[PDB]
Amino acid sequence: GSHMRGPNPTAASLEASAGPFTVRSFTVSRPSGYGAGTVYYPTNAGGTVGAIAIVPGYTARQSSIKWWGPRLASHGFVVITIDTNSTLDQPESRSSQQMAALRQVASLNGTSSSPIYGKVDTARMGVMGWSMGGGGSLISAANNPSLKAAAPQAPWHSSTNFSSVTVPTLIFACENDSIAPVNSSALPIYDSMSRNAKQFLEINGGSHSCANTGNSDQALIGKKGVAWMKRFMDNDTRYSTFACENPNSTRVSDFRTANCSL
C-alpha cells in the first residue's frame, strides 16, 4: 500500500524552497471547532494527497508556522495551518482543534464548491505544531494511532510520557531552547517512545523559534519534514534514506533515530 507521487527525490529537490507542484491557498469560511485556518493545496499532484494539520504555540498564530504550508503542499499534501479558539489554549485543547481541522479538511474534500474537492485521501493524515502545538500533535498521535506521521517542533506538554505512541514521530528540537528546554521537554518526550519509528533532530544553537517562519535552516528542516511525511504518510520507500539518514550537517547539534530503516 504505497501512494508515490512526483519525481524521484534528490537532496537538491528536497532542500529547494519549492517542491514540484504548484500551490494555491484559501481561508476557511466557517471554521468548525478551531479559530481560523488557511488551506494550502497542490493544483497538479496527479492523485489524492494526505492532509497535515499544523498548530502554533501559546500566544502564537498561523504566522509562526505558515512556512510549512507551501513547503509541504508543493511536495503533494493538503496542509491546514490553524489559529486556536484562544491564543491561551493548553495542549489538550490544541490537540482537539488540530483533529477538528483534519475533520473539516475531510468535509471540504467532499464539498464541490471547495478548491480541495476530491484532492484529499482522508485515510492518510499527519500532525505538526510548535511548543504547546507540538505537545498537542503528540496527544493527537496518542489518541488517534491511525495518523500516519507526527513532526512537532520544540514540543512541550505537562507530561513527557508518550510511551503509547505507535505513529512515526520526528521531533525538531532547538539546542538553546530556554522556553521548553530540550533536557526537560523534547528529549524526555523522544525517550518515552519505544513502539514507533522516531527521530530527534536538534538545531545547533537554536532558540525556541528555530523551526518557525523566518528560520535560517529551511533547506535542512524542510528536507527532513517533507522526507518524513513522504516516507510515512505515502509509504514512499524512495524517501527511506532522506527520512532515516543522519543529514551530516554542522547545523545539527544532535541526531537520534530508531525503527527507521534505510
Measured at the CA of 259, the angle between CA 255 and CA 260, to 5 degrees, comes to 60
Do the annotations mark residue 132 as ligand-binding? yes
Structural domains in the chain (count): 1
The 3-state DSSP class for residue 133 equals: helix
Do the annotations mark residue 233 as ligand-binding? no
Task: Choose, from 89, 121, 177, 217, the residue flagged as catalytic.
Answer: 177
Experimental method for this entry?
X-ray
Task: Choose, from 208, 209, 217, 234, the residue flagged as catalytic.
Answer: 208
CB proximity list for 185: less than 8 A, separation 6 or greater = 154, 155, 156, 157, 160, 177
Do the annotations mark residue 156 as ligand-binding? yes
Q: Identify whether 177 is a catalytic site residue.
A: yes
Contact 144, 122 (CB under 8 A): no
Q: Identify whether 208 is a catalytic site residue.
A: yes
Which residues, listed in sequence order, are joined to residue 126 by a DSSP beta bridge?
52, 149
Task: Choose, from 93, 96, 114, 131, the residue flagged as catalytic.
Answer: 131
Q: b/e string for 126-150 if b means 16 or more Cβ within 10 A?
A: bbbbbbbbbbbbbbbbbebeebbbb
Contact 7, 74 (CB under 8 A): no
CA-to-CA distance for 261 and 241, rounded, in angstroms? 8
Could you tell me the residue range of the domain that residue 24 belongs to?
1-262
Classify residue 85 by burial, with Cβ atoms within 10 Å: 0-12, 13-18, 19+. Answer: middle
Q: Identify whether 234 is a catalytic site residue.
A: no
Contacts of 214-219 with CB under 8 Å at 24 or more apart are: 214/67, 215/67, 217/251, 218/17, 218/67, 218/71, 219/15, 219/16
CA-to-CA distance for 147 and 119, rounded, in angstroms? 18
Q: In which residue are the cell numbers 492518510 written?
A: 124
